[PDB]
């Protein structure tokens, strides 16, 4: 299935020209721009791996785009996303986050139902590729 | 004589700690606007009419509200704007009941005043700082959901009433899986003969978890904990908590004290707290009495709910876009700037209280997404009704069309595309890749 | 088309279990009254506008409100009375929040309807029977106080705010000892920087007990337990209980759920529960939107408060005597009979719920006692303000004058004296034996 | 002090003609009419002594008035009151109660303050004549 | 025993010249001046009887002194005190209170010990003259 | 470079919401006063020394303290006054621990700074308004005791330690009966092998009630509830409450969190809360490090104790009268006005927090009463030691002499007598009628 984490995951995968225009947006919003990747796609996996530090005070999309592609070359079967952090007082948080690489195939999640008191159930989801070590996923 | 008792004071200097109110006043025919101002002040501050010695045992002036400014309503000869100031020490810290009792209670004067509507309030910084503010707030809510830079999408289950727990859960699962971020209980669905509340909560949580596992997203359903007594609301809130719900809802009819009680509970228990307030109730289109919605926004942001329905501009809700924009600012901004066309009469610092998320609900549909984004911004939950459930291809399909239109519109906005003007063509490019969206767009062109 | 969806049904037969509402509707210009009726029904029952298959999984008709009758408002060409029926199974038993959410929430239709005001409700017997009704009620309250056959007498402390606990208790003791049955906290006095609530409660109970010992009567002071959260209201209610207070009060701004919570507490703890509702607030003189006060009376009698301010006829409150009389009936009678001039549109059986005590408060004074008795009956608390505290001879004196006028008037009524006509002479005979009353009567003849 | 229990205790003591008109009221209201007396005037003394049974279905004030005066002769230094009971559904209770004899002199109540937790006080009032046996009061 | 409620009750009873100078103080402090009396001298009897209203905005001691003496004539076997109330913001309370008449003889208080849980005792004090009606005290 | 990082800002504009501190700084030899200022600010705001990118994810400037003004200490070439401003949003509302952690914790800079002493703080109105303030306060305390217009009188039991419960109660009864308003436990007496706390509390309450019955006054003994754990302090506080004590005490060594916990308990349970702080401890006569006592007064008034020992001017405590006067103002006034000789460096509004009662304790004796009244005012507890217990005629006698001297002095003050100058003759007129006072006055003329 398609994982729909990300601001634009109901759209087709973005071209590089689209990705470029999203960097321009971020630049005009004065955001720090980070690139993160993971192959544990749990929705509560809050800390993806960082591909370098976030870039600050950037003024041209080129170098961001260049790292995105180098991450894609190094981690081609990982999810990779781009995140734009705001430092505006009272936000101080991500304000956009979108996918720029997905694995070829997504097998999705197992749903675990542990039966508890009365009719209640304690739930877990476990991404199928996480049943394997990281270097064997996707 | 009310101007004579001191209640009228053209010279009063407003202090940073004063609570200030702005009433739209209609003097009873042949009574001076200045006497009318004074009457409203003189009664929301004291209820006396004789030689009362006991005032002299107190610092009496401190407790008197001061009518300090009267302008004539533009475009309305016999309506006036009265500004009233109240000392901070009159109010219980942290208490909405006390604030409302004090302001919109004892504003009598049936002999000088024909009509009265409270239009706005300047809550001073030090007062605001005595309230919790939103239990979660926009920023934390988005970090909990991992959802950034786009409005959120919800709808109410259809039909509001009647489905058994299992069939109710079916709708919730379909809609969440098909793309909605949220589904919600109707304000009317609490616990009734055709369905009690515990089975609804249990079947819903199965639907919600099934949807998260189908999509790899955090998903939520607003469980309505509204009930007749505080103990009952708590037992309901506690099941939501126990089963792992990300969000609950309450109706504004439960009242201010139960609201503050819930807001503290939501803060203490990591729960998003959505507040339902009927967008068009009997108490709506009054230019003349009661209180303007923006004062509700202020009081509810202070009380600490996380979502409130704030209006849309287009669709079946026909409101002034600029007044609506003023509601959103009140909910969202760290400081409000006086702006007469938005109906904000006071500058106001929000004292770093968290932000409430506006909800837009009404006859709204996917073909209006450019107008919705342009008027309402990215921090909003857009709620579609029969616009999802009644997609001729199924609930999942309807949810998908709405989600794709949303995302394609924010994409265009972020590209600096003139999306207000190019809106229909943007949607039609998006629908090219999306049958469900193509189906929806046709569905909604007999409208216009 | 709303008349087309079934929401309009001229033929519907009203069942004894239906909840019935009567709205005053103002159709948006050039829309059929019948379409407007239907719109109000069609939205306070369902929020759908498309092909929704999921209705077919339910007994859908059951959940649809039925507009079943439309009359044109007498003396008003473009206002109509719409009668709407709702199945009993839509409502949570015992829950005011659910009742109000369901009725005055989703009554939308911004395209057929310009204005809407809810005028009356027929609560069916079996529904009413799911509510507690007054915690104490008129009969039990009078057996607790040992006070029969006369209105009760109260006033609010003057000034409402500022007195320290000890000086506040002074006023309470003076007034009770001089003849009042009750003294009361202002709706605004909760707990504030100039006085916190615990010392008020402690000094008050000393005043109340001193007054009982000075008079050989049960005496009471309404301690205001209003607060921001349910826990806080309970701690306040619990001190009142602990110290032996016969009575407490709450403000209606705390909201319906905190009200029902308190009403159950008052029933469980033998406490009279007075409910303050501002007689002239911003939400008052509306012929056009919102809800008529009599629906509040119904809902509050059901929730189970013991006293509510119901209006006076004379004095500074200028109301239609016959509409006011309708409020009193709602509060007091075991059955209500349709009566258009009183604004009662439905017969209604009260299902043996206890009676609420009306409170009359306003510019009322001792020289009006014949009108007060004649219009308001013996079951009422008469509340006088600066009419007691500001008697030139002292608070005790002012209380005495009011008490003697009250008693002399009921004496005359019971003698079958034509007290409405002979009122002034009755008072003047009473004042012959009562200097304080003589002083009061003169005091109040510059009025007229 | 004057005890102000009773519907008309802020008025002067009623004459027999006034008392008569109050019986007429009660009769027209269809009330049972009772006569009760006490020399423990505590406000929470709910059960005064009964002087006979209440009178039911009465149609002339004379016999009520006659018993009131006979009670006054037998119990001249007691409080005596007249009570009118309603049997109307949803009332079923006293609806008028008024004093028709008081002792020559009322010494009033003692107030007792028992100090309890923190600043709270438990209160009692004790009518001074109750410090003595009943046959020595007033 | 001497009751030592009052700002100056460890001093001898004040002469009228001393009382006069205390009024002058109160006047210069801009206080409301009240006269109160009681013959229940319990320390927790917070509400003495008022002899008239308090006097406000007074500028000469004479009229205060005159009422003090008239209270003394009417209530010679009562405690009488003079109280000065401040209306200054954040005080709004009595700031002086002193005795200007005492009964000839003070018999004092009974101490009541009600035995409660374990070794604890609930205490009451009861002024001996309050065992009698008010018109028989002192 | 600290002036380089932004921590130094000669131009910063102070906001009404800033927390401001005034340190007395001693730059390490050959370091610029301006660099020293900056160092103190730069470390009580951040602990960083490298290229830290993560600052850029926050509104970093907001969290930086700003050294904004440096004056040179008058009469001290190498000491400077540094004024530091902190944004309100850095502080937890209502929390002394957080305030002190933030201000006097991370003020490092061991390379630019040799010595540092915190001299004063400007707590902003909106911050102060987040604290409870005194549980009872001077005005309520006096209405509870019915004691007006004179200092209160106490002493500590003698000897502090050793008496069994019954002999301890003997001293307490003697002293209260003889005239003291209060007697008190020593800070050291908690619960020990020579006497456990429950029997002390029980025998004390018998003494206190016996004294009230002997005098017709409210009497009190400060039961020390100090203990090692919060549960233990509560069990002690709860017995005091149960047995009807008007007052308890705690030692300042229990620490800020237990203090705030107790202050809320005292507010909730109508108990006067006396706070012991040793007048001359190892941490006293520092012109050079630590924190000036007036900052403690501020923090304790905010936390909400009712009494704190504030110093005397005369006797064995030898302090600058004008600095001491500054401590009393901090405790007592509704607003403080900058005044350099009193050591108040900031104007400050107390936001209607209640007043704390200063306690004066030391070698003070009855022959100094004119100086005590003149320097310390009427709102103070004067505490005499061996000055009561060791009156050659008995404890009652000693208490009487002190009480008569007190009352005769206030009498003289109120008569506008030049009591500072005529003090000894005033006492000697009073002693004419008072053998115990005559005995005391002689006793204390070998001193001088
Ligand atoms: Cl007991
Ligand atoms: Mg909504
Ligand atoms: Mg009222
Ligand atoms: Mg000490």
Distance separating alpha carbons of residues B161 and B159, to the nearest angstrom: 5
Determine contact, residues A111/A92, Cβ cutoff 8 Å: no
For residue B66, what are the β-bridge partners?
B85
Distance separating alpha carbons of residues D117 and E46, to the nearest angstrom: 18
Distance separating alpha carbons of residues F183 and F395, to the nearest angstrom: 12
Distance separating alpha carbons of residues B125 and B137, to the nearest angstrom: 19
| DSSP 8-state secondary structure symbol assigned to residue B117 | E
Burial C177-203 (b: 16+ CB within 10 A, else e): bbbbbbbbbbbbbbbbbbbbbbbbbbb
Find all residues with CB under 8 Å of D136, minimum gap 6, and list them.
none
How far, in Å, from the CA of B359 to the mean position of ligand 2? Answer: 7
Q: Which chain C residues in 181-210 lie under 8 Å from chain B, judged by CB atoms?
A: 186-188, 190-194
Q: How many CB atoms lie within 10 A of CB E113?
A: 11
Query: Which site among E33, E57, E88, E92 would you substitute to test the B interface, given the most B Cβ atoms closer than 10 Å to its Cβ?
Result: E92
Q: Is F241 a catalytic residue?
A: no
Distance separating alpha carbons of residues C208 and E47, to the nearest angstrom: 11
Distance separating alpha carbons of residues F232 and D102, to the nearest angstrom: 58
Distance separating alpha carbons of residues F410 and F426, to the nearest angstrom: 10
**B247, C44, C105 from C257: Cα distances, Å:** 21, 21, 16
For residue E94, what are the β-bridge partners?
E85
The residue annotated as part of the active site, out of F69, F114, F129, F158, is F158
The residue annotated as part of the active site, out of C177, C276, C298, C365, is C276
Determine contact, residues F166/F174, Cβ cutoff 8 Å: no
Element (H, E) at D113: strand D109-115
Measured in whole angstroms, how far is the alpha carbon of residue C61 from the centre of its chain? 36
How many Cβ pairs within 8 Å bridge chains A and F? 21
D125 contacts chain E (CB < 8 A): no
For the record, the structure tokens of C422 come out as 């002979």
Locate tokens 């939103």: which residue? Answer: B134
**Torsional class of D30: left (φ above 0), alpha (ψ -120 to 50), beta (otherwise):** left
Which of these, E99, C199, C170, D115, lies nearest to F218 by C-alpha position? D115
Distance separating alpha carbons of residues C67 and E104, to the nearest angstrom: 84
Name the neighbours of B, counting chains with at least 3 Cβ pairs within 8 A.
Answer: A, C, E, F
D41, D47, D53, D57: CA torsion to nearest 10: 90
Distance separating alpha carbons of residues F93 and C209, to the nearest angstrom: 41
- Resolution, given in Å to one decimal, reads 2.0
**Residue in C163, C164, C207 nearest the CB of E47:** C207
Determine contact, residues C297/C343, Cβ cutoff 8 Å: no
Burial F226-250 (b: 16+ CB within 10 A, else e): bbeeeeebeebbebbbbbbbbbbbb
Cβ distance F59 to A88 less than 8 Å, yes or no, reads yes
| Closest-approaching ligand to the CA atom of C364 | 3
Which of these, B392, B361, B402, B355, lies nearest to B184 by C-alpha position? B361
Got the DSSP string for F23-47?
EEEEEPSS--HHHHHHHHHHHTT--
**CATH of A1-138 among 3.40.50.2300, 3.30.190.10, 2.50.20.10, 3.30.460.20:** 3.30.190.10
Cβ distance D113 to E124 less than 8 Å, yes or no, reads yes
**A32, A115, B23, B124, B347 from B329: Cα distances, Å:** 26, 46, 20, 17, 12
Distance separating alpha carbons of residues F312 and F298, to the nearest angstrom: 18
Cβ distance C166 to E85 less than 8 Å, yes or no, reads no
Locate tokens 């629908």: which residue? Answer: B431
Provide, as residue numbers in chain A, all residues whose Cβ is less than 8 Å from the Cβ of F52.
none
Cβ distance C162 to E92 less than 8 Å, yes or no, reads yes
**Residue in D107, D113, D131 nearest the CB of E42:** D113
Distance separating alpha carbons of residues D102 and D94, to the nearest angstrom: 21
Which of these, F35, F10, F15, F16, lies nearest to F25 by C-alpha position? F35
Cβ distance B17 to F125 less than 8 Å, yes or no, reads yes
Considering all CA atoms of chain A, what is the largest pairwise distance in Å, rounded to the nearest integer?
59
Distance separating alpha carbons of residues E115 and F6, to the nearest angstrom: 70
Distance separating alpha carbons of residues F125 and F123, to the nearest angstrom: 7
Q: Is C391 a catalytic residue?
A: no
Which of these, B414, B406, B420, lies nearest to B365 by C-alpha position? B406
Between F395-414 and E16-28, two packed helices, what is the crossing angle to 10 degrees? 60
Query: Which site among F15, F17, F56 would you substitute to test the A interface, given the most A Cβ atoms closer than 10 Å to its Cβ?
Result: F56
**C219, D115, F170, F271 from F246: Cα distances, Å:** 28, 11, 19, 6
How far, in Å, from the CA of C251 to the mean position of ligand 3? Answer: 9
For the record, the structure tokens of C175 come out as 């007034």
Cβ distance A123 to B218 less than 8 Å, yes or no, reads no
For the record, the structure tokens of D19 come out as 């008392």
Domain definitions of chain A by residue range? 1-138
Distance separating alpha carbons of residues C198 and C236, to the nearest angstrom: 8
C243, C245, C249, C254: CA torsion to nearest 10: 30
Spell out the domains of chain F, with CATH numbers in brackets. Answer: 5-131 (3.30.70.150), 132-444 (3.20.20.110)
Distance separating alpha carbons of residues C407 and C410, to the nearest angstrom: 5
Distance separating alpha carbons of residues F436 and F428, to the nearest angstrom: 12
Q: What are phi and psi of F81, to 5 degrees?
A: -90, 115
Long-range contacts of F424-427 (CB under 8 A, 24+ apart): F424/F367, F424/F370, F426/F370, F427/F366, F427/F367, F427/F369, F427/F370
**A66, A100, C307 from A63: Cα distances, Å:** 5, 15, 74
For the record, the structure tokens of B62 come out as 């401190």
Element (H, E) at B120: strand B113-122
Locate tokens 């809050």: which residue? Answer: A46
Determine contact, residues E105/E77, Cβ cutoff 8 Å: no
Burial B158-182 (b: 16+ CB within 10 A, else e): bbbbbbebeebbbbbbbbbbbbbbb
How far, in Å, from the CA of C47 to the mean position of ligand 2? Answer: 11
Which of these, F23, F21, F20, lies nearest to F288 by C-alpha position? F23
For the record, the structure tokens of C352 come out as 């043996």
Q: Where are the beta strands (DSSP E) in F326-368?
A: 335-336, 348-349, 357-361
| DSSP 8-state secondary structure symbol assigned to residue D37 | E
Q: What are phi and psi of F185, to 5 degrees?
A: -70, 150
- The alpha-carbon gap from A58 to the nearest alpha carbon of chain B, in Å, equals 17
Q: Which residue of C has its CA nearest to F139?
A: C164
**Residue B32 three-state SS:** coil
**Torsional class of D40: left (φ above 0), alpha (ψ -120 to 50), beta (otherwise):** beta
Cβ distance C193 to B89 less than 8 Å, yes or no, reads yes
């Amino acid at each position: 299935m398609r994982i729909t984490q990300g601001t634009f995951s109901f759209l087709p995968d973005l071209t590089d020209e689209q990705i470029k225009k999203q960097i321009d947006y971020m630049i005009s919003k004065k955001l720090a721009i980070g690139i993160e990747y993971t192959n544990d796609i749990h929705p509560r996996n809050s800390f993806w791996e960082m591909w370098g530090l976030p870039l600050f005070e950037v003024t041209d999309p080129a170098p961001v785009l260049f790292e995105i592609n180098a991450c894609r070359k190094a981690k081609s079967n990982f999810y990779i996303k781009v995140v734009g952090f705001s430092s505006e007082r009272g936000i101080e948080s991500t304000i956009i986050s979108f996918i720029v690489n997905r694995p070829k195939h997504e097998p999705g999640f197992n749903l675990i139902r542990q039966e508890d008191k009365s009719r209640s159930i304690k739930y877990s989801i476990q991404a199928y590729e996480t049943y394997k070590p990281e270097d064997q996923r996707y | 004589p009310y101007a004579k008792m001191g209640y009228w004071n053209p010279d009063y200097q407003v202090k940073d700690t004063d609570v200030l109110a702005l009433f739209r006043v209609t003097p009873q025919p042949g009574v001076d606007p200045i006497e009318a101002a004074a009457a409203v002040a003189g009664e929301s501050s004291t209820a006396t009419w004789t030689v009362v010695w006991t005032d002299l045992l107190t610092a009496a002036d401190l407790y008197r509200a001061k009518a300090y400014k009267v302008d004539q309503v533009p475009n309305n000869p016999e309506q006036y704007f009265a500004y009233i100031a109240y000392e901070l020490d009159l109010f219980e810290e942290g208490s909405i009941a006390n604030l409302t009792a004090s302001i919109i209670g004892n504003v009598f004067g049936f002999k000088a005043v024909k009509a009265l509507r409270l239009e706005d309030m300047r809550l001073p910084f030090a007062y605001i700082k005595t309230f919790q503010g939103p239990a979660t707030g926009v920023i934390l809510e988005r970090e909990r959901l991992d959802k950034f830079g786009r409005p959120l999408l919800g709808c109410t289950t259809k039909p509001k009433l009647g489905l058994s727990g299992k069939n109710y859960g079916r709708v919730v699962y379909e809609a969440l899986k098909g793309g909605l971020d949220f589904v919600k209980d109707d304000e009317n669905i609490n616990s009734q003969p055709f369905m009690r509340w515990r089975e609804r909560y249990l079947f819903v949580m199965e639907a919600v978890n099934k949807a998260a596992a189908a999509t790899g997203e955090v998903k939520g359903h607003y469980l309505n904990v509204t009930a007749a007594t505080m103990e009952e609301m708590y037992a309901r809130a506690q099941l939501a908590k126990e089963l792992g719900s990300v969000i609950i809802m309450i109706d504004l009819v439960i009242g201010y004290t139960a609201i503050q009680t819930m807001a503290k509970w939501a803060r203490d228990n990591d729960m998003i707290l959505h507040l339902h307030r009927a967008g068009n109730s009997t108490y709506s289109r009054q230019k003349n009495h009661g209180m303007n919605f923006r004062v509700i926004c202020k009081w509810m942001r202070m009380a600490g709910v996380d979502h409130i329905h704030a209006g849309t501009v287009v669709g079946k809700l026909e409101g002034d876009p600029i007044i609506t924009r003023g509601f959103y600012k009140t909910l969202l901004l760290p400081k409000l700037e006086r702006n007469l066309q938005e109906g904000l009469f006071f500058d106001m610092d929000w004292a770093s209280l968290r932000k409430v998320m506006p909800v837009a609900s009404g006859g709204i549909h996917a073909g209006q997404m450019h107008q919705l984004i342009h008027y309402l911004g990215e921090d909003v939950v857009l709620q579609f009704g029969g616009g999802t459930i009644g997609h001729p291809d199924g609930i999942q399909s309807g949810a998908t069309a709405n989600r794709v239109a949303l995302e394609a519109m924010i994409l265009a906005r972020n590209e600096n595309r003139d999306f207000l003007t190019e809106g229909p063509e943007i949607l039609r490019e998006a629908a090219k890749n999306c049958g469900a969206l193509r189906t929806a767009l046709d569905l909604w062109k007999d409208i216009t």
